[PDB]
Amino acid sequence: MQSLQDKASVLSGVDQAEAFAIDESNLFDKLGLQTFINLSTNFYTRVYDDEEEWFQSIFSNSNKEDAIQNQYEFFVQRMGGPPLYSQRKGHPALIGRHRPFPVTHQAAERWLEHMQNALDDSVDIDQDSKIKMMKFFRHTAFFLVAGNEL
Amino acid sequence: MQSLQDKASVLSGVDQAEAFAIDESNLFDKLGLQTFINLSTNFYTRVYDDEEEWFQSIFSNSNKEDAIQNQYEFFVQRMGGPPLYSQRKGHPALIGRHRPFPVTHQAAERWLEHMQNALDDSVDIDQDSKIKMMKFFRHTAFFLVAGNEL
Ligand code: HEM
Ligand code: HEM
Ligand code: NA
Ligand code: NA
């Protein structure tokens, strides 16, 4: 309430401080490009095989392989790697770029569920990193929810 | 047209490639924190002394010293320095965070004018950097205009 990052914390239960703990060490240096590519691939397989119509139909106007490229490049860029996303698309502008979608509370949890699963399948992400990443995903999911409202 | 970064290029005359040339070398390493603090201070002095009512009244609900802190921290973060902005506020989410303001074509040029002046007064920014920075400011100003429309 009264500030996007505040709504995100209240809704998500993740403190903004926690959310950006990713910035304390270079995760990309820890995990490498391939971890991120596999992660987003896994994630989007699940999304595009999601049987939950309402979710899934959210992604109908996008290409699976494009969305994968969009996502891992943002993650690579944002977690210590080279700025691949900006090189190609400019500012992440997450709220702006999610404007066309119905980013609801329920949708945030669905998104986060597929991601939790994709993170679990990941063979190359250590616990500490998994926690930091989920804290970041979860805070920002609800940051998007807050943005979808205002 | 059809894509935020495309509108920005068409309106602004700055190719998105040009806009993100800042990512080729560490500008923060070149210029240091103080350059950025002085730059934003200069800039916001001008903004808050702007006699153009319509512009200036855009910034009425903000504190001069807060806006300065917001801006130089984003620039520091985005041009090679430590992620000060995110540490404090989370995602830059530029379109989202400019939603409350009337970000018009005319406003973009005004903003860019004060910035051009502030860049000129800067004693520690070399030509090459000035060009890269203005390309980045100008592209992103119109990216914000595009965002203000859609
Ligand atoms: C709240 C639940 C969310 C929903 C329903 C959602 C939905 C979508 C959809 C439909 C797209 C377009 C796919 C594409 O063509 O690239 C997209 C793009 C994207 N999403 Fe999400 N998203 C959510 C949360 C998140 C979160 C938590 C992150 C980051 C941690 C994120 C980052 C992105 C990025 C980087 C893109 C690509 C932007 C672009 O290049 O256009 N999203 N999202
Ligand atoms: C298009 C012309 C623009 C107008 C009229 C405009 C207006 C504003 C206003 C009124 C604020 C709130 C001040 C504050 O309290 O921090 C603001 C914040 C900000 N603007 Fe702009 N702006 C423009 C373009 C830009 C450009 C080109 C950039 C980056 C290159 C930028 C980056 C920011 C940032 C980082 C903030 C602080 C966000 C926050 O923490 O809430 N703006 N802008
Ligand atoms: Na942004
Ligand atoms: Na953003």
Q: What is the DSSP secondary-structure string of B4-34?
A: HHHHHHHHH---HHHHTGGGGS-HHHHHHHH
Note whether A92 contacts B90, CB cutoff 8 Å. no
Task: Give the span between the Cα atoms of B68 and B86, in whole angstroms.
Answer: 15
Give the method used: X-ray
Task: Give the span between the Cα atoms of A21 and A11, in whole angstroms.
Answer: 19
Ligand 2 residue neighbourhood (C-beta within 6 Å): B 58-59, 62, 66-67, 70-71, 74, 89, 92, 94, 97-98, 101, 103, 107-108, 111, 137, 140-141, 144
Ligand 4 centroid distance, CA of A75 (Å) = 12
Residue B136, phi-psi category: left (phi > 0), alpha (psi -120 to 50), beta (remainder): alpha
Whether B22 contacts B75, CB under 8 Å: no
Which resolution, in Å, applies to this structure? Answer: 2.7
Among residues B142, B103, B132, B133, the alpha carbon closest in space to that of B5 is found at B142
Note whether B16 contacts A90, CB cutoff 8 Å. yes
Q: Which residue has the tokens 């996502």?
A: A71
In one-letter notation, the amino acid at residue B114 is H
Q: DSSP letter at A108? A: H
Q: DSSP letter at A2? A: -
Vertex A70: Cα angle to A86 and A64 (nearest 5): 160
Cα A9 to its chain centre, rounded Å, is 16
Name every chain B residue with its beta carbon within 8 A of the beta carbon of A92.
91-92
Task: Give the span between the Cα atoms of B64 and B62, in whole angstroms.
Answer: 6
Ligand 2 centroid distance, CA of B48 (Å) = 13
Contacts of B73 (CB under 8 A, 6+ apart): B84, B85, B88
Closest alpha carbon within chain A to B100: A150
Task: Give the span between the Cα atoms of B150 and B144, in whole angstroms.
Answer: 10
Delineate the domains of chain B, giving CATH numbers in brackets.
1-150 (1.10.490.10)
Q: Whose CA is nearest to atom 35 of ligand 2?
A: B71
Cα B93 to its chain centre, rounded Å, is 13
Task: Give the span between the Cα atoms of A142 and A4, in whole angstroms.
Answer: 9
Mutate to test the interface with B, among A95, A101, A135, A140 (most CBs of B within 10 A): A95
Other CB atoms within a 10 A radius of the CB of residue A46 amount to: 16
Note whether A147 contacts B87, CB cutoff 8 Å. no
